[PDB]
């Protein structure tokens, strides 16, 4: 199961960053687009709870 | 007290080896510096061509 988790997380890293351009991120700051993808579900869940 | 036919008096092999390999490594390092003659000449000529 550890090997399977490693494969899954490697695929995650690939699909998330291997096609991402790091030329403009000299200092290695957090990516705002990945932040948005991580953040949208929180608001979705809050709205779902209220409704 | 056994120090002159198979115990002690064999300084030469590897002390005359000390000096002979001093000769050999001097030759080899001079040859390395001569090879670096061409290496650094190519680098310098490229820089001048670059410059």
């Amino acid at each position: 199961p550890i090997v399977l988790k490693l494969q899954e997380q490697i695929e995650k890293h690939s699909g998330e960053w291997s096609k991402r351009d790091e030329t403009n991120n000299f200092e290695q700051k957090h990516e705002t687009e990945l932040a948005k993808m991580l953040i949208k579900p929180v608001v979705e869940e809050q709205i779902k709870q209220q409704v | 007290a056994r120090i002159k036919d198979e115990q002690k008096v064999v300084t030469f092999n590897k002390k005359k080896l000390i000096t002979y390999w001093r000769k050999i490594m001097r030759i080899a390092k001079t040859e390395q510096l001569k090879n670096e003659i061409d290496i650094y000449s190519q680098n310098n000529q490229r820089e001048l061509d670059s410059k």
């Binding site: - | 002159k4 008096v9 064999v10 300084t11 030469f12 092999n13 005359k16 000390i18 001093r22 000769k23």
Partner: protein, 185 residues
Amino acid sequence: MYDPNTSQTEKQKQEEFLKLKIQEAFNLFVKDKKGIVDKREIPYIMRYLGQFPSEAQVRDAILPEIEEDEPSEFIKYSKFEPYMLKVLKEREYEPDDPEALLAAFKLLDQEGKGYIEIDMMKTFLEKQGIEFREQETKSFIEFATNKDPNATVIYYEDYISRLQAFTDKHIESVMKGYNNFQVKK
């Protein structure tokens, strides 16, 4: 260095020793041409092997025998190897026994202070016997006084002890490369 108290095989071994130590010291003292080093380095070359030649000794016996028929400013190693071989075999210029220096400094310090003033040491080694140059005398005084520039006297006993220790250390280093050579078939 050379020990003439051996059999035929060990005698040949020590002959080739003297030869090879000449070769190695010469190699360390060579500038351009293999097998030839300046006669001036001859005292230095063979002190590298364990000889204590007087400068007059080097001028009078070491050089004339090693030189060729015509006056030349260089020595062939092929020639100094036989001469230095005989020299080391006979131990003509090996560093004499250290109480020699002990008595030398005792005689120099005529006043029996337990030490010799730097000025007195300078006078003794510049006007008595073979004359040190300025560099030789200054370095002598420095090492004898333990690198104390402010000392007005030289601790001759301390210098003698340190000189004996350094002589033994370098002679051991030289004999590291004294011994082996096997009869080559």
